[PDB]
Amino acid sequence: MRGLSRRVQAMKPSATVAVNAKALELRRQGVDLVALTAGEPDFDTPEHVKEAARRALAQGKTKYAPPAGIPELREALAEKFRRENGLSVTPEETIVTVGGSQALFNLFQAILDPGDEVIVLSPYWVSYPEMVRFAGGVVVEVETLPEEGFVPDPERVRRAITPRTKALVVNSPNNPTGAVYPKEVLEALARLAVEHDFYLVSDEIYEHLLYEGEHFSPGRVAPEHTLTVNGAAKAFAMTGWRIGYACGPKEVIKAMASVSSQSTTSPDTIAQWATLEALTNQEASRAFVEMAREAYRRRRDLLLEGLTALGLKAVRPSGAFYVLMDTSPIAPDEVRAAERLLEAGVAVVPGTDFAAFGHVRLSYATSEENLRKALERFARVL
């Protein structure tokens, strides 16, 4: 018999896609749009990393690599996690994946049985519920509030814990809120995992995109319960290279490697060698990170000042490059609001898919010139 499987037919339709279609038809008819939808840095990948790629090519490093990644990179990862994050991990507790997205995918496939529950904090990155459901898991949502700066309340999270809880996903700095969680909150969440016996999944890919505060890794207090996900995508403008990495409990890391061996085999060899350089040449990478950080901060300040002048509400973010704007004064709901802005000449992402109802996500990974234009168009709508 023919026909698709139940797991693939169950995939929910994105609201972001429908808005995006209307954006394309407008472009076709000559309409000038300013896009504030980018989920990746506007800067190109730094030359020290590109150069390392060129060397690998000439050195003929074009053969299959081990499922968990070339050993040199696994060693550099153990160094990065300890030095930058205060995490006590060995090279064997590290893994290279096809982007941080595959680390999360392999992780869920490795720890979830049909029926297992995963607590997610809304607004959340679109992929979390999809991944949990594709592995037969049950999504249990806990909401963070705008009035609380979108920082989780440990008390609201405890109420979502049941005998079936397998994991808790935390993402700080956060996409789409841009919130940075204080160390006290993160320690409180780690404590819940220890007491209730479940995994704490910490998505930290935005660690270097920080404007105020400190990036705390919960793996510092509960290493055997925490699975730290990270990658080179957002920090070094390497989204198209597809290189991510994680660390955590030996048996879980080993399980994730077995999944890669039956699916992707191993990440692109040239990209693994280029990433080793990004981690080893701290001087050149630090220079790129500081340059991007100062640029994003100027862009963020400019945006918030403008939004405030227009009377538009948006919680001030401390990390990443996003801003959740309240659309109440523009329309009754975020989808209708996003369509109105398109007609005004500004492309935004509706908050529907992130569970950020009544809000729209704005990205400041664009030039200041583009941010000023958008603010002008916002004024016209009001």
Ligand X SMILES: *Cc1c(COP(=O)(O)O)cnc(C)c1O
In whole angstroms, how close is the CB of 311 to a copy of itself at the nearest point?
Answer: 34
175 binds, options ligand X, a copy of itself, none, Cβ within 5 to 8 A by partner type: ligand X
The C-alpha atoms of residue 267 and residue 181 are separated, in whole angstroms, by 31
231 binds, options a copy of itself, ligand X, none, Cβ within 5 to 8 A by partner type: ligand X
Inter-residue contact 234 to 224 (CB < 8 Å)? no
The C-alpha atoms of residue 172 and residue 254 are separated, in whole angstroms, by 25
Q: Which pairs from 146-151 meet CB under 8 Å and 24+ separation? A: 146/315, 146/324, 146/326, 149/179, 149/315, 150/123, 150/174, 150/177, 150/179, 150/315, 150/324, 151/179, 151/181, 151/182, 151/185
Of the candidate spans 19-27, 54-62, 209-217, 298-306, the one that interacts with a copy of itself by CB under 8 A turns out to be: 54-62
Please indicate if the annotation marks 306 as binding a ligand. no
205 binds, options ligand X, a copy of itself, none, Cβ within 5 to 8 A by partner type: ligand X
Between vectors from CA 236 to CA 234 and to CA 237, what angle results, nearest 5°?
65
173 binds, options a copy of itself, ligand X, none, Cβ within 5 to 8 A by partner type: none
Do strands 117-122 and 165-171 pair parallel, antiparallel, or not at all (unpaired)? parallel
In whole angstroms, how close is the CB of 310 to a copy of itself at the nearest point?
Answer: 30
Of the candidate spans 105-113, 169-177, 340-348, 369-377, the one that interacts with a copy of itself by CB under 8 A turns out to be: 105-113
In whole angstroms, how close is the CB of 159 to a copy of itself at the nearest point?
Answer: 18
User: Rounded to the nearest 10 degrees, how much is the dihedral formed by the CA atoms of 11, 172, 356, 320?
Assistant: -100
Angle between helices 282-309 and 269-280 (to 10 degrees): 90
Choose, by CB under 6 A, the member of 41, 69, 99, 317 that binds ligand X: 99
For a copy of itself, the closer of residues 209 and 259 by Cβ is 259
Q: Which residues are annotated as a binding site?
A: 39, 125, 175, 361
Binding site for ligand X (CB under 6 A): 99-101, 125, 171, 175, 203, 205, 231, 233-234, 239, 244, 265
